[PDB]
């Protein structure tokens, strides 16, 4: 953020650590009686958050290979290929 | 990591088929298409050193019942004659 020539960089590393921080937000979120017991079971879910994750949406890619094959798609650019491929 | 090493092969082997679908769609056996033909000559052979793992001295189609009992090495080979009926096109 000091240095002049990289904002853009200074834009997208930033942004995560608006959630990184809400991740210590809901930290001391442990106290409502409806809120605290069960958000334990997210303490028993949160390895398992990167379970299901790699999981699905590595599923996702045994889908998002899968679409763009058969069909004759032709939008590409510089890191937009990359979505027409797979962003989309 | 012998399953690691295994595992990342193979979850790089259909990245090398992703490859050879989309950009190179050629009719030709190209310079990225002929380890294929070596990588399939690669995993079939791995049944070789299984059906000469462990059989009896004498049942050669008594112990490749079992490789019929398994509907997984059915979906082994049946992903193979897929592909003869995929590579012949």
Redesign the interface.
């Given at each position: 953020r000091l240095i002049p020539a990289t904002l853009y960089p200074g834009r997208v590393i930033l942004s995560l650590d608006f959630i990184l921080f809400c991740l210590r937000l809901m930290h001391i979120f442990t106290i409502s009686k409806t809120l605290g017991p069960k958000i334990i079971i997210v303490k028993r879910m949160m390895k398992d958050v990167f379970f299901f994750l790699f999981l699905l949406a590595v599923w996702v890619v045994s889908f998002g290979?899968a679409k763009?094959?058969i069909l004759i798609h032709n939008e590409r650019r510089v890191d937009w290929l990359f979505r027409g491929?797979v962003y989309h | 990591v012998v399953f690691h090493l295994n595992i990342l092969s193979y979850f790089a082997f259909l990245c090398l088929f992703?490859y050879v679908?989309?950009v190179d769609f050629q009719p030709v056996p190209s310079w990225c298409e002929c380890a294929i033909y070596l990588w399939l000559f690669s995993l079939v052979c791995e049944e070789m050193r299984q059906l000469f793992y462990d059989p009896d001295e004498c049942g050669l189609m008594k112990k490749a019942a079992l490789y019929f009992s398994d509907f997984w090495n059915k979906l082994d080979v049946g992903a193979i004659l897929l592909f003869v009926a995929g590579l012949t096109c």
């Open positions: 290979v763009q094959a491929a | 992703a679908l989309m």
